[PDB]
Amino acid sequence: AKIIFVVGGPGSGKGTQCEKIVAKYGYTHLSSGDLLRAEVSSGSERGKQLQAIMQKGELVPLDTVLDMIKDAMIAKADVSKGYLIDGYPREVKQGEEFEKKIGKPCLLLYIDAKGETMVKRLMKRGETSGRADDNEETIKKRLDLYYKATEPVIAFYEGRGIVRKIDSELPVDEVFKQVSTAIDAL
Ligand SMILES: Nc1ncnc2c1ncn2[C@@H]1O[C@H](COP(=O)(O)OP(=O)(O)OP(=O)(O)OP(=O)(O)OP(=O)(O)OC[C@H]2O[C@@H](n3cnc4c(N)ncnc43)[C@H](O)[C@@H]2O)[C@@H](O)[C@H]1O
């Protein structure tokens, strides 16, 4: 099965575009954030540790996140012709371990938004839906961690030759036209 990585800053639009891909193309959307949140909601001790980390806007350890992604991919293996890995990898080492333990991606959709745009989007969502990490201080930390840890992922996969940059400043449907062009070109 094809493995597509979807990487971009917090609030850039990764989840939105992934849900569009699912509806049009039928790939399996796995979200690292949603997996981690599902553990938090289980009430486990592990979930309590993850909630603490996520609330602070820091990165969860690679071992826990990659486990859960692998767990989810195995659970869907029967029925998936492709996977969208949304929000993983977030550092170069995550990408390398994923390739060692699972397989190589065929495409990286780089969901590119401006920093100010991301702040605005996450503040709006936080005011609405109240996700715990959508508060101003945590937003700032998430964005700074993205620039520091995650942009080198984009460089790594530029070196591999598989990055397609998606202008996520446009309206949702215009972003998805770019996304669709990239996927149709595989
Ligand atoms: N691999 C990893 N390693 C270690 N730790 C990890 C990890 N993965 C996760 N974690 C941990 O878990 C935390 C959460 O990670 P995760 O949940 O993956 O959150 P994120 O990167 O913080 O993503 P969001 O879901 O905040 O953004 P999105 O880019 O999907 O934007 P969306 O489409 O929702 O859109 C945002 C909003 O904007 C709107 N919007 C989208 N596109 C547009 C558009 N084109 N125009 C106008 N509005 C738009 C949406 O409607 C919505 O309101 C991390 O901070 C970390 O602690």
Residue numbers in the entry: 8 to 193
Task: Kindly provide excerpts from the paper associated with this entry.
To confirm that thermal stabilization caused by the Val-to-Ile mutations resulted from the optimized hydrophobic CORE packing, we determined the crystal structure of a V28I/V118I/V173I mutant of AKNc. The Tm value of the V28I/V118I/V173I mutant was 11.3 °C higher than that of the WT AKNc, and was identical to that of AKDr, the most thermally stable homologue of the three tropical AKs. The overall tertiary structure of the mutant was essentially identical to that of the WT. In the mutant structure, the conformations of the residues neighboring the mutated Ile28 residue were almost indistinguishable from those around Val28 in the WT AKNc structure. This allows the added terminal methyl group (Cδ1) of the Ile28 side chain to interact hydrophobically with other residues in the CORE domain—such as Val13, Cys25, Leu91, Leu116, Val186, and Ile190—indicating the enhancement of the hydrophobic packing by the V28I mutation. The conformation of Ile118 was essentially identical to that of Val118 in the WT structure, with the exception of the extra methyl group (Cδ1) in its side chain, which makes additional hydrophobic contacts with Val13, Gln24, Leu116, and Val186 in β1, α1, β4, and α9, respectively, in the mutant structure. In contrast, the side chain conformation of the mutated Ile173 residue was distinct from that of Val173 in WT AKNc. The χ1 dihedral angle along the bond between the Cα and Cβ atoms of Ile173 was rotated ~120° relative to that of Val173 in the WT AKNc structure. The flipped side chain of Ile173 interacts hydrophobically with residues in β4, β5, and α9, including Leu116, Arg171, Val182, Val186, and Ala189. It seems that the improvement in hydrophobic CORE packing by the Val-to-Ile mutations increased the structural stability at high temperatures and decreased the catalytic activity at low temperatures.
AK is a small enzyme that catalyzes a reversible phosphoryl transfer reaction between ATP/AMP and two ADPs. The structures comprised the characteristic three-domain arrangement: the CORE (residues 1–38, 69–136, and 143–193), AMPbind (residues 39–68), and LID (residues 137–142) domains. The static CORE domain provides substrate-binding sites, and the dynamic AMPbind and LID domains close over the AMP and ATP sites, respectively, upon substrate binding. AK is a small protein that undergoes relatively large conformational changes upon substrate binding and product release, and has long been used as a model system for studying connections between structure, function, and dynamics.
